[PDB]
Amino acid sequence: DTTVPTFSLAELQQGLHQDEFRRCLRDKGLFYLTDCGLTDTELKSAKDLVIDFFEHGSEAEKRAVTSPVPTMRRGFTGLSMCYSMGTADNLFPSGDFERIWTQYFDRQYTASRAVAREVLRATGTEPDGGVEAFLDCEPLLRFRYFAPHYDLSMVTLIQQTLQAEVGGAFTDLPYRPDAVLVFCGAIATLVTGGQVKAPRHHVATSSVFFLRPNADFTFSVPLARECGFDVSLDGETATFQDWIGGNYVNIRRTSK
Amino acid sequence: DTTVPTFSLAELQQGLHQDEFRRCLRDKGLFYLTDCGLTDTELKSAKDLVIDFFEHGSEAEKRAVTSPVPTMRRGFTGLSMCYSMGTADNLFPSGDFERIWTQYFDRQYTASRAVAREVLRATGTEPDGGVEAFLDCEPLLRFRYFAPHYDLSMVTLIQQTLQAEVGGAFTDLPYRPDAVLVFCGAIATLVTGGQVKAPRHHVATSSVFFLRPNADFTFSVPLARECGFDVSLDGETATFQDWIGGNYVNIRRTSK
Amino acid sequence: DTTVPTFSLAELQQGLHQDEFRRCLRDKGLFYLTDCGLTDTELKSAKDLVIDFFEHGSEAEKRAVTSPVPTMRRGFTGLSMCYSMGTADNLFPSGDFERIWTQYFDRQYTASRAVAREVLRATGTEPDGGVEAFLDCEPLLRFRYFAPHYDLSMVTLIQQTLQAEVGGAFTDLPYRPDAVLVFCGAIATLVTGGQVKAPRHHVATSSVFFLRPNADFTFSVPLARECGFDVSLDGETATFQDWIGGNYVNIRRTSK
Numbered sequence A, B, C: 001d002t003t004v005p006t007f008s009l010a011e012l013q014q015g016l017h018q019d020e021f022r023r024c025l026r027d028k029g030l031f032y033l034t035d036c037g038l039t040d041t042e043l044k045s046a047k048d049l050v051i052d053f054f055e056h057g058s059e060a061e062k063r064a065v066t067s068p069v070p071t072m073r074r075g076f077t078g079l080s081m082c083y084s085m086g087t088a089d090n091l092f093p094s095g096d097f098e099r100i101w102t103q104y105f106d107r108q109y110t111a112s113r114a115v116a117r118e119v120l121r122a123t124g125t126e127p128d129g130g131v132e133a134f135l136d137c138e139p140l141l142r143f144r145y146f147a148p149h150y151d152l153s154m155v156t157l158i159q160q161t162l163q164a165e166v167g168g169a170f171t172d173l174p175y176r177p178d179a180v181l182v183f184c185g186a187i188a189t190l191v192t193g194g195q196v197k198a199p200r201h202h203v204a205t206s207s208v209f210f211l212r213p214n215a216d217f218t219f220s221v222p223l224a225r226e227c228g229f230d231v232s233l234d235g236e237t238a239t240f241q242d243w244i245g246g247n248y249v250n251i252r253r254t255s256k
């Protein structure tokens, strides 16, 4: 009914709880994940450090880590405030920032890839071009400081020190110790041929890690149509780029 | 001034009221349509049946007709609730559902094509690739249960058991017996070289049938620019896909 | 800190105040501009004339200058009301309208190109395909009569008879005599490799002139990524069209 399991990554990789995992994937498309290299500690360390910067970083040094266009892709954004990162072109205040945040990013990127790898394994999915080339992709990490959507990611990881639709009701998703919250996104549904649900969710700090596909991730157009994707795509295969266009879009509303 | 005519499809096909029809097309881009194979009865039959499902369908069987991504393209969506259909990949609770709804869909798809065929005939329009290949397209039917936009369809049919702009005022569009409401959309304007208005409208159950072009519907870029389309398209011809991108977009707001 | 300079175009072209201009570009991305062929008078003349049309133009003649799709690209739109223009396919009530407005448009298009030419010169930027082919582009003028965004233009010129972010605070931008307000847009940032800021701004009549790139404006994908553009573009170069798609988009919000 409206419950959300915890899975241990380690157990999934050993091949335990495979029916339960497949059933969670198909019916809910969200779960908590443990034993994935993330603690709860390290969050603290990255959090306090960037929070000090938000609170006590000088306006002059905020400038040095602000992109010239206000996209929230890298560095600082003031609207509430955000700090964003990916695998390259980062903007680090540094001294020690780069160290703590490169580590926090990398562990989340490892955890995201390894859980996506298990989603693919559990569903018998081989992406066009292979699993590895699919998962060596374009992640985006956003950390922010102070309307229902689904994600266009493969998975999205959300760390806590939030509500989602489960079984037809929007439910709260409280903290579970040393567990991260995983939302499957629309690329999971797409890549698996419909075996994975992309749940709606929304709010009511935050750390959100999107495991986003490469521009050239390629999929079958008829199979996309079958899963519920309302594609306007001529011909039999397409890319991520063809579908979403030339700028990443991270989330989507159900049409009004 | 601010009146909306009824046309009989049958009369338009006989070549009656052709100046009146052309003038409605160009100045208003909306009308009621009779004698098009739709009753008022059959609405009831599809309505009551899906409404029973909305009201009394079990959460477990709603799951079997819910797409894994919440696009409202096929099957059930809960936000108020929706049931969607097209020509293929449907999700039917069935027993008799599939029968009543396949019929309700088909008659609306027939009525939409036949009225679009008369829009094209009245305006002297031959789409690139022919009329038939244009009208053998990608319709979408949405039925829902409990801000002004124009439609990006060829026509949109709306059945009643609503306000639009006519002559510079937003007016009510009450029911007329055994008539369906037709809104011309932006593909009508585009395909006809500007001979058809795409009116703005909005709300204040619902059945909406969008007659949407194929991804490969091809048109002239300079002629599009002339009709008011603010295209960013290099070269002399383009497709629907090139214009709108790789996911259908059904409605649009005037830029804020 | 939070001040906005006036530059004289004439002085910039003579090579004066070049460090100050570069520093304004990089840190603020907005300024007032004088000595650019715009007065304050001519505004009046175009304003009063179109305002008379808004107030006293007959509904029948508003129809003759209304596009069949309500895009606000050319002619009249009623929502408050708008009058739009570009280099071709205009809709003029005329008698003398076309004269006053063709002049008001042309002087703004001259001023926009000449200031963009100085942005490019100041930053040592040679666009792929040359400066001239870049600036011979697709401008759009909107004049209207009675949420923070950045512009996707090269520059946007705004005439006054408004708030923006400067140094981390949203500030008012009062009138300065015989000066026009210039906002640099995201194409300035993109084309210059990040040397120009695209500031956020918003409201709280209006004349807005967008100097928009051609569909085929071509840029480097890795350099775009470096400047903060969250592109989903395979391969090493791309066009405006590839990035934004097949319909112009003039403004953008920072992701929510």
Ligand SMILES: CC1=C(C(=O)O)N2C(=O)[C@@H](NC(=O)CCC[C@@H](N)C(=O)O)[C@H]2SC1
Residues within 6 Å of the ligand: A254, A255, A256, B142, B151, B156, B157, B158, B162, B183, B202, B203, B206, B208, B248, B249, B250, B251, B252
């Ligand atoms: C007839 C009509 C009405 C109406 O309210 O009556 N409008 C509605 O209620 C709308 N029908 C829809 O579901 C619009 C959502 C499509 C949107 N997700 C997109 O992809 O662009 C419009 S479409 C035409």
Ligand SMILES: CC1=C(C(=O)O)N2C(=O)[C@@H](NC(=O)CCC[C@@H](N)C(=O)O)[C@H]2SC1
Residues within 6 Å of the ligand: B254, B255, B256, C142, C151, C156, C157, C158, C162, C183, C202, C203, C206, C208, C248, C249, C250, C251, C252
């Ligand atoms: C100068 C300025 C202002 C302003 O309010 O002053 N902002 C405005 O009022 C805006 N001008 C517009 O018409 C924006 C709508 C474009 C939008 N439909 C899209 O396609 O993306 C902006 S553009 C720059």
Ligand SMILES: CC1=C(C(=O)O)N2C(=O)[C@@H](NC(=O)CCC[C@@H](N)C(=O)O)[C@H]2SC1
Residues within 6 Å of the ligand: A142, A151, A156, A157, A158, A162, A183, A202, A203, A206, A208, A248, A249, A250, A251, A252, C254, C255, C256
């Ligand atoms: C986990 C989660 C949450 C959440 O609130 O917790 N939602 C958020 O707060 C969202 N994270 C974002 O920054 C969304 C903005 C992306 C948007 N500009 C676009 O390009 O499409 C979502 S993404 C998943």
Ligand SMILES: [Fe+2]
Residues within 6 Å of the ligand: A149, A150, A151, A156, A183, A201, A202, A251
């Ligand atoms: Fe989300």
Ligand SMILES: [Fe+2]
Residues within 6 Å of the ligand: B149, B150, B151, B156, B183, B201, B202, B251
């Ligand atoms: Fe509509």
Ligand SMILES: [Fe+2]
Residues within 6 Å of the ligand: C149, C150, C151, C156, C183, C201, C202, C251
């Ligand atoms: Fe703007």
